[PDB]
Tab-separated table of C-alpha atoms in Angstrom:
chain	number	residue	atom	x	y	z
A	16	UNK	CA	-3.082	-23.305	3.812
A	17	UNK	CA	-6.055	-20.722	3.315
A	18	UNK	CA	-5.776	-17.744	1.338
A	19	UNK	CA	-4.882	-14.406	3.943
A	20	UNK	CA	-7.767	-12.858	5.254
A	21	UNK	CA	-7.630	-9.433	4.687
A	22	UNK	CA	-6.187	-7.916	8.077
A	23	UNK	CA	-3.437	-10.413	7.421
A	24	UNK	CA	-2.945	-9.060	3.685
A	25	UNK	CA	-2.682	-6.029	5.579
A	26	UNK	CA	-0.063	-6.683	7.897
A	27	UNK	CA	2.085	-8.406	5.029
A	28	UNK	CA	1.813	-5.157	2.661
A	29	UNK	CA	3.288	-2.402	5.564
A	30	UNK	CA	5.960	-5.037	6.666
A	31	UNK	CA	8.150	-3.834	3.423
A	32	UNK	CA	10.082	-1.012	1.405
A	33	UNK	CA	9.959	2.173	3.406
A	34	UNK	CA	10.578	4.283	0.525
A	35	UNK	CA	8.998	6.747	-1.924
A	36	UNK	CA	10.355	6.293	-5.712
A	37	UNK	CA	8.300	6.957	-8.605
A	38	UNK	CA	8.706	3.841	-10.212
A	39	UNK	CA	10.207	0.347	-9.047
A	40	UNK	CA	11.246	-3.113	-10.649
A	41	UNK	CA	9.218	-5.475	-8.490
A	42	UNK	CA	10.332	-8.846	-10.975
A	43	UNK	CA	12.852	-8.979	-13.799
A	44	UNK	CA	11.966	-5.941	-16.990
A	45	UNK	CA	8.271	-5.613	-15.039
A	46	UNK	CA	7.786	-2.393	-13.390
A	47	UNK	CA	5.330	-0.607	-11.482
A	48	UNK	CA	4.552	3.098	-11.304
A	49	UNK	CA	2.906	6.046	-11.083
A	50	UNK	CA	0.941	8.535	-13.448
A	51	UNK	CA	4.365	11.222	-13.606
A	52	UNK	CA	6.467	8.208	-14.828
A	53	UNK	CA	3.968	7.812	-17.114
A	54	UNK	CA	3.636	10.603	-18.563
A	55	UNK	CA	7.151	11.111	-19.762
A	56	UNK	CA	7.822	9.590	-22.773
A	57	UNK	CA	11.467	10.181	-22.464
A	58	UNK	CA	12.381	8.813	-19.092
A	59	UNK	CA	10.114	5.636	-20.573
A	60	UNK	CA	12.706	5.403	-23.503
A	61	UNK	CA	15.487	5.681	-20.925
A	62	UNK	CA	14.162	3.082	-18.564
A	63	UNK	CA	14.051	0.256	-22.150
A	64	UNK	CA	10.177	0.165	-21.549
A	65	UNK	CA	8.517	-1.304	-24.630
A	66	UNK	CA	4.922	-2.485	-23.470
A	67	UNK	CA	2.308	-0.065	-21.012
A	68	UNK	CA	-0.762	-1.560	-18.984
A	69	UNK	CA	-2.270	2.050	-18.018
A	70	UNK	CA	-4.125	0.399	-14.892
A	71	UNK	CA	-6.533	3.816	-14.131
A	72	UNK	CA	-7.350	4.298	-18.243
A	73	UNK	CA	-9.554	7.194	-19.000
A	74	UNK	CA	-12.251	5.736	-21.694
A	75	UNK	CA	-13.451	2.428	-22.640
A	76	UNK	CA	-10.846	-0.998	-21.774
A	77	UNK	CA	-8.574	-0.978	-25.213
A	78	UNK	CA	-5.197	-1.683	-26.368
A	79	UNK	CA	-3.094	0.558	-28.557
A	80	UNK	CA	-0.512	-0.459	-31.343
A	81	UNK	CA	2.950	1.803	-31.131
A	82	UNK	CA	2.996	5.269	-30.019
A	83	UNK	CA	2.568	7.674	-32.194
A	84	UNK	CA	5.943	9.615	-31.546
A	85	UNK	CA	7.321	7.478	-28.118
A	86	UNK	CA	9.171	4.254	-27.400
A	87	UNK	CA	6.261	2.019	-26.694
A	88	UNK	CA	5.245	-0.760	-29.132
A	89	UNK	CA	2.250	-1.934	-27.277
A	90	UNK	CA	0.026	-0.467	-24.707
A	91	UNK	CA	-3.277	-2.041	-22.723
A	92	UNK	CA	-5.939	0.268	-20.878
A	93	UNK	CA	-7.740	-0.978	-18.170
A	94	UNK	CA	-10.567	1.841	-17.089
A	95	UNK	CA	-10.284	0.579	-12.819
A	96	UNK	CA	-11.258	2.772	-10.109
A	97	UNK	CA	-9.958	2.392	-6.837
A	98	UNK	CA	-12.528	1.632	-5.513
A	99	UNK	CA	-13.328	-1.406	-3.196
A	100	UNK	CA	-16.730	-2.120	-5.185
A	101	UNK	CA	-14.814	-1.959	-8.646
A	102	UNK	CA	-14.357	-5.489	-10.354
A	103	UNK	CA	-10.587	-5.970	-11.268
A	104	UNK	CA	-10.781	-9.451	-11.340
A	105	UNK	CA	-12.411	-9.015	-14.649
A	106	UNK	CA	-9.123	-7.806	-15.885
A	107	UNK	CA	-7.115	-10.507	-14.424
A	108	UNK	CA	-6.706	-12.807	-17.465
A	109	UNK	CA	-6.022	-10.220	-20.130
A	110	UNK	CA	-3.675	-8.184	-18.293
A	111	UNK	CA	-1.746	-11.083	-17.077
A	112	UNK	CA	-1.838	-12.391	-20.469
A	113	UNK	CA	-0.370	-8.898	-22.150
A	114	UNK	CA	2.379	-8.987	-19.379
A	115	UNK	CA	3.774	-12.557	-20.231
A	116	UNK	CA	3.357	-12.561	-23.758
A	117	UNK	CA	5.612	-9.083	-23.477
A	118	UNK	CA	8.172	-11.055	-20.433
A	119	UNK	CA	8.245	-13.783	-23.145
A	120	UNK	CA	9.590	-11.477	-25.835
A	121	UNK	CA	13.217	-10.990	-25.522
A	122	UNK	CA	14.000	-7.179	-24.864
A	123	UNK	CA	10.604	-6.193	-24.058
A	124	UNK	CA	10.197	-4.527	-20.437
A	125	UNK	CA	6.576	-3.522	-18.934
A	126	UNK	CA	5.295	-0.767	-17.335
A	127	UNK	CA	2.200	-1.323	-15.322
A	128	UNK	CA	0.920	2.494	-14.012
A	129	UNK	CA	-1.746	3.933	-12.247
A	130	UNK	CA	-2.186	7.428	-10.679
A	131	UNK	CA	0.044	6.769	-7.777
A	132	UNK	CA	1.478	2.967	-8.355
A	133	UNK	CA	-0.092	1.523	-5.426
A	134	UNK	CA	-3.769	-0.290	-5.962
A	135	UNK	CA	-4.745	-0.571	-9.554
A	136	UNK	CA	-1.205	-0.923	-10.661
A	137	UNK	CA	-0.152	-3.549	-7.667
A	138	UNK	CA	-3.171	-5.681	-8.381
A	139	UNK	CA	-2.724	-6.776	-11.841
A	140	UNK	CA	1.259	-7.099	-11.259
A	141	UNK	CA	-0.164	-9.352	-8.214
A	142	UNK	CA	-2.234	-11.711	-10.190
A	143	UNK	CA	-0.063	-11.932	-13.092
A	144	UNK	CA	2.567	-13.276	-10.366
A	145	UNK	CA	0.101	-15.941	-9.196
A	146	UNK	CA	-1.552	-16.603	-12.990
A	147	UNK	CA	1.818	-17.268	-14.049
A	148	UNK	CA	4.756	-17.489	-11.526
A	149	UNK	CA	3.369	-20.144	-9.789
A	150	UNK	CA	3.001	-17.495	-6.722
A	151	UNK	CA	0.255	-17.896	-4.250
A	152	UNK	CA	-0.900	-14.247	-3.107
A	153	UNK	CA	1.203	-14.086	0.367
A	154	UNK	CA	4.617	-15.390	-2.000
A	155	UNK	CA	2.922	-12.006	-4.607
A	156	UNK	CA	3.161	-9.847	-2.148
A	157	UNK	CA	5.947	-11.149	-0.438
A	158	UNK	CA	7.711	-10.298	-3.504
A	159	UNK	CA	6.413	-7.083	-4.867
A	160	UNK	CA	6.750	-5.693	-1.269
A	161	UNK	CA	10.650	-5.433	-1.121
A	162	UNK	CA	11.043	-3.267	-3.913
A	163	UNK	CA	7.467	-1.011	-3.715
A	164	UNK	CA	5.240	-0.175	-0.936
A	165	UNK	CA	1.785	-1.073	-2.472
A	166	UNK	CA	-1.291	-1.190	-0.833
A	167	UNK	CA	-4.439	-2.663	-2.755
A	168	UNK	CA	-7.691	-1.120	-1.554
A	169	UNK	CA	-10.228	-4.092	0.747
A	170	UNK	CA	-12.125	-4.658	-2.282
A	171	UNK	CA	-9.089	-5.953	-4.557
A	172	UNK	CA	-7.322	-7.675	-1.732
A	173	UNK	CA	-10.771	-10.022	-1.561
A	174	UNK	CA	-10.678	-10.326	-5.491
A	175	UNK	CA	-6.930	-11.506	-5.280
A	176	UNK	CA	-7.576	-13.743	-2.284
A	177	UNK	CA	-10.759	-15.074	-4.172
A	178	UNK	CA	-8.014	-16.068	-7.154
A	179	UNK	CA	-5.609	-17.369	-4.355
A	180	UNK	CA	-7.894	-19.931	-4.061
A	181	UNK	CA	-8.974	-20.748	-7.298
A	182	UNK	CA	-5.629	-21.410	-8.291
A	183	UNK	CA	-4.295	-23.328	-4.756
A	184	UNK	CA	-7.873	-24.972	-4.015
A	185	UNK	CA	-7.785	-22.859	-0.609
């Protein structure tokens, strides 16, 4: 089966949730959001988040120990754009590495943000799914669909399709 082209990726990502919420489970303690949820520190302690990938970080690519006053034990900045010329797929592999080793820490939940929750953030929750969940991208999206409308810009939806058959061997 070959990887969806990109009008199919498409058609898969608006078949979903019709809804609007800030911030969504899309797979068990793994989250995805948006820059407001964020940005408050106490709603993050009331949600049980421990770990933050910051998918549209503002500096140089970096990970943080603890927060200096909130919840969060463990943060990773990844400086994307959302743009369809920006390379994400450089990001792939440590990302989806910070998400597992926090999934495979009991108690720990994730956060993965961007400004609005719906390229930067989707993308790395996407291949993290097929890097380690044994997804291919249609079963990713499939997934993450039901529980947040996301909507990768053309350039990441080639980068994950590009990894979709990597992994599967087209």
């Amino acid at each position: 089966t070959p990887a969806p082209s990109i009008l199919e990726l498409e058609e898969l990502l608006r078949a979903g949730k019709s809804s609007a919420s800030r911030v969504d489970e899309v797979w068990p303690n793994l989250f995805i959001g948006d820059a407001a949820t964020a940005n408050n520190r106490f709603e993050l302690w009331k949600l049980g988040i421990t770990h933050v990938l910051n998918a549209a970080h503002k500096g140089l690519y970096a990970q943080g120990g603890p927060d200096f006053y909130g919840s969060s034990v463990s943060y990773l900045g990844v400086p994307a754009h959302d743009l369809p010329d920006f390379d994400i797929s450089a990001y792939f592999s440590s990302a989806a590495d910070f998400i597992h080793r926090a999934l495979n820490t009991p108690g720990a939940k994730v956060l993965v943000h961007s400004v609005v929750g719906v390229s930067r953030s989707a993308t790395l929750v996407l291949a993290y799914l097929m890097l380690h969940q044994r997804l291919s991208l249609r079963q990713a999206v499939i997934t993450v669909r039901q529980h947040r409308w996301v909507f990768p810009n053309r350039g990441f939806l080639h980068q994950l399709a590009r990894l979709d058959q990597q992994l599967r061997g087209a």
